[PDB]
Scaffold this active site. Structure first.
Site, PDB file in Angstrom:
ATOM      1  N   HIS A  21       0.823  -1.205   0.000  1.00 39.97           N
ATOM      2  CA  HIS A  21       0.000   0.000   0.000  1.00 39.97           C
ATOM      3  C   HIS A  21       0.861   1.260   0.000  1.00 39.97           C
ATOM      4  CE1 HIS A  21       0.637  -0.211   4.450  1.00 39.97           C
ATOM      5  NE2 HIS A  21       0.632   1.104   4.320  1.00 39.97           N
ATOM      6  N   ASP A  47       0.143  -7.571   1.584  1.00 38.05           N
ATOM      7  CA  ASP A  47       0.475  -6.152   1.580  1.00 38.05           C
ATOM      8  C   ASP A  47       1.983  -5.946   1.714  1.00 38.05           C
ATOM      9  OD1 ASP A  47       0.148  -3.401   1.558  1.00 38.05           O
ATOM     10  OD2 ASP A  47      -0.306  -3.283   3.703  1.00 38.05           O
ATOM     11  N   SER A  91       4.970   1.989   8.291  1.00 41.47           N
ATOM     12  CA  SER A  91       4.638   0.903   7.326  1.00 41.47           C
ATOM     13  C   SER A  91       5.837   0.469   6.540  1.00 41.47           C
ATOM     14  CB  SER A  91       3.568   1.412   6.371  1.00 41.47           C
ATOM     15  OG  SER A  91       2.327   1.442   7.068  1.00 41.47           O
ATOM     16  N   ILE A 136      -7.861 -23.785  -5.460  1.00 41.18           N
ATOM     17  CA  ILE A 136      -8.685 -24.985  -5.522  1.00 41.18           C
ATOM     18  C   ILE A 136     -10.140 -24.694  -5.898  1.00 41.18           C
ATOM     19  CG2 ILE A 136      -9.498 -25.045  -3.138  1.00 41.18           C
ATOM     20  CD1 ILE A 136      -9.007 -28.022  -3.108  1.00 41.18           C
ATOM     21  N   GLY A 137     -10.434 -23.438  -6.217  1.00 39.02           N
ATOM     22  CA  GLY A 137     -11.768 -23.051  -6.641  1.00 39.02           C
ATOM     23  C   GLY A 137     -12.857 -23.428  -5.656  1.00 39.02           C
ATOM     24  N   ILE A 138     -12.663 -23.064  -4.393  1.00 39.05           N
ATOM     25  CA  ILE A 138     -13.619 -23.418  -3.349  1.00 39.05           C
ATOM     26  C   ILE A 138     -13.707 -22.371  -2.242  1.00 39.05           C
ATOM     27  CG2 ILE A 138     -13.880 -24.904  -1.330  1.00 39.05           C
ATOM     28  CD1 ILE A 138     -13.629 -27.299  -3.017  1.00 39.05           C
ATOM     29  N   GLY A 139     -14.928 -22.111  -1.788  1.00 40.48           N
ATOM     30  CA  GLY A 139     -15.162 -21.227  -0.663  1.00 40.48           C
ATOM     31  C   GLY A 139     -16.037 -21.909   0.370  1.00 40.48           C
ATOM     32  N   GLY A 140     -15.447 -22.267   1.505  1.00 36.79           N
ATOM     33  CA  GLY A 140     -16.169 -23.006   2.523  1.00 36.79           C
ATOM     34  C   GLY A 140     -16.043 -22.447   3.926  1.00 36.79           C
ATOM     35  N   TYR A 165      -3.342 -19.273  -8.196  1.00 38.33           N
ATOM     36  CA  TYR A 165      -4.446 -18.399  -7.818  1.00 38.33           C
ATOM     37  C   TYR A 165      -4.696 -17.344  -8.898  1.00 38.33           C
ATOM     38  CZ  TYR A 165      -7.610 -16.925  -4.105  1.00 38.33           C
ATOM     39  OH  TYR A 165      -8.734 -16.641  -3.374  1.00 38.33           O
TER      40      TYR A 165
END
Lengths: 293, 279, 295
Positions: C52, C82, C157, C215-219, C293
């Site tokens: 940032h 970041d 930062s 892995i194309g997954i949201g759990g 990703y």
């Protein structure tokens, strides 16, 4: 070559510091207030701030080892903003290091363990800024500290470099004139323990009450106000008169006396010598119980 | 484990040493707006520097004070006299006529403050009473202006002004004076306080005690002097574009010439250093 | 006489680490649009700073405590953690941030925050390690920040968070300013641990970015359900449906949905791994090819 660290006190005291959640059910269950707690003994009794568990339909106590219990409100004291929670633990429980002989000195490095903003158990470092800090009631007798204190530290532990409990984080100075920095308050362990043992034993804090207001020739506490129909008024004590002695004990300090009064079993008739018109007057008084908040 | 044998990490040593010398300053003035009742316009701290009763504090703490009340942690209360002040260093010396003796702040002249030195701030934030806060010397010679500051992350608040900043040993390191308040995003700066280095503080005090004010040299002026005061500069014949040596010497300068006694002459142009009018 | 005694000081840590901490200046023209701090990890001239801090910088000027000033080149920027690696040309050598891989951060460790708060210059604030493995202000991202009550302000930062020994502990990244009840947080800053920091740096020096297994997954959290299944994703081609519970991934049980999403990030894109799932009360060991990703 080892880095200067307080990890010792952390590993010693942190375990005994829990996350206290107050939740209520609304037209379901949701956290209305969260804070911290300190497991004092193996029995599972936990000290926390009363303002943390006020009107709590369900009190959830979360430990650092993962275990989560449902706290039982053992009792609370709005006078010292203290409260005790009970939790049945079949397994072993981490307790907070406690040294009754330890006298906290100003300048002692202290650690504030709590759950600020529900981020998890946070350890902040500071020192004892001051001791015997009041605030009007004067019952709290806070220890000031510059260890970072935030919403979620209430009921949390303030320990020294040895992990020994010094106080129960209760307050953060909020008064403007800007934003006060490094000014927090905690209940001295000496008081926190005194209240705990009393809440567990009586379900509440039972205090003697003479119904008198006064602030500390002869040395005595001066009466300023006399609670109507109070033990004082009844006995014939008056505002102007000066209290030389209370229950066969010298009235040397208005604060040490009010502590002595709070220890008198209600219903006890005690002598109270005063000074009216430069004349010693012995007035028998009957101790009531402190009026409910 | 048993910790009864153990000893807790404590800077109480510095406290018992320094604290008793740090006093509560109360800037009090009659309220003309109301009914002339005495009120506390401002409250800060002070540091007793010697047995004579000379206390250092911030000028901004005693400004517009109809009465300056100094309270010692031992209970004693005095009506402090304003010996003198200095706007530039924001320092001010008070005096208290104590029949008995009084505590002094541990001062080690040969002590050099280092970045990282654990420090303790001693003052009266929000009139809570003598408060101790721990930090470290975040920086040195911070300052805009010509001022030199010890930066510190020791939690500093209103009332700490004029208070003592000390090391673990309890030796005076600086006089807490300022606190970073400016915000880029409206957020409040954290752990960024400033103090007057004790070397500078003692210097300004000794001068104030002697002259009632801080009289410092005035010159009237790869360093080119654009203009020349109608004074010591104008004399000797120093030109406008005039251009390396001063008093047999190579910010470093204006602090050096400031310590030059008025009446003394220093060269070749020969200029006589006089007194710099401040107020 | 105290004049013969020794003052408690963390100056030791300051001398070892301070010089290695540099001031990062971000420039854009309609001058300095932003500024922060950086830390020199290697002699090559690679610096670590927050993403940032340097974002959208037409020019990145770095300044050292010794006086030297360089124009940095951005090796790579990782939005997730970041972080950002910089490059400068170094003559006569540079001060380097002391790193001990063997050293393990301990909660309660006294840490000095070295940075350039409000452009005041190199500032050393002292505190401790409040906690480790923290999610941060946002739960998402598996941030694993180190929490510290050492005063952290704008300008720290990409700065160095170090122990009393001077060993780098973490890179100061975030400060807590979230306000409810009108609260101003006090002593709650976050820093990316040095081990993590070092790891990201190399993945950026080696490549102009960081690649992690996807892995194309949201759990959500024993097992881990699958609310969302990315189209044409690794799990999409594997046939993994929605509402099905996951038990183990790559021989490693799936207890925590956080310690797992970190493992999947480690698996080099392309590799084939086993994924057990309890669907309709049945165990099904699937084969899924991990991909990198989405950009």
């Amino acid at each position: 070559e080892t880095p200067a660290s307080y990890n010792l006190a952390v590993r010693r005291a942190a375990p005994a510091v829990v996350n206290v959640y107050n939740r209520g059910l609304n037209t379901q269950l949701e956290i209305r207030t969260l804070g911290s707690g300190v497991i004092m003994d193996q029995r599972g009794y936990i000290i926390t701030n009363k303002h943390v568990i006020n009107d709590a339909d369900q009190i959830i106590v979360a430990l650092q080892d993962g275990r989560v219990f449902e706290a039982l409100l053992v009792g609370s004291d709005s006078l010292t903003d203290l409260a005790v929670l009970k939790i049945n633990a079949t397994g072993g429980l981490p307790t907070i290091p406690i040294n009754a002989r330890r006298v906290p000195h100003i300048g002692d490095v202290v650690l504030a363990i709590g759950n600020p903003y529900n981020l998890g158990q946070t350890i902040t470092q500071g020192i004892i800024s001051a001791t015997g800090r009041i605030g009007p009631t004067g019952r709290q007798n806070f220890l000031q500290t510059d260890a970072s204190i935030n919403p979620g530290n209430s009921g949390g532990a303030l320990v020294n470099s040895l992990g020994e409990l010094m106080g129960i984080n209760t307050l953060s100075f909020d008064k403007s004139n800007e934003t006060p920095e490094g000014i927090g308050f905690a209940i001295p362990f000496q008081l926190a323990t005194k209240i705990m043992d009393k809440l567990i034993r009586d379900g509440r804090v039972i205090r003697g009450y003479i119904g008198i207001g006064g602030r500390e020739q002869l040395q005595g506490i001066v009466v300023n106000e006399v609670s109507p129909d109070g033990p004082a008024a009844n006995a014939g004590i008056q505002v102007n008169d000066l209290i030389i002695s209370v229950d066969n004990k010298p009235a040397i300090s208005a604060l040490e006396t009010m502590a002595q009064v709070a220890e008198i079993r209600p219903g006890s008739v005690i002598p109270v010598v005063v000074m009216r018109d430069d004349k010693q007057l012995t007035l028998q008084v009957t101790i009531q119980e402190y009026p409910a908040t």
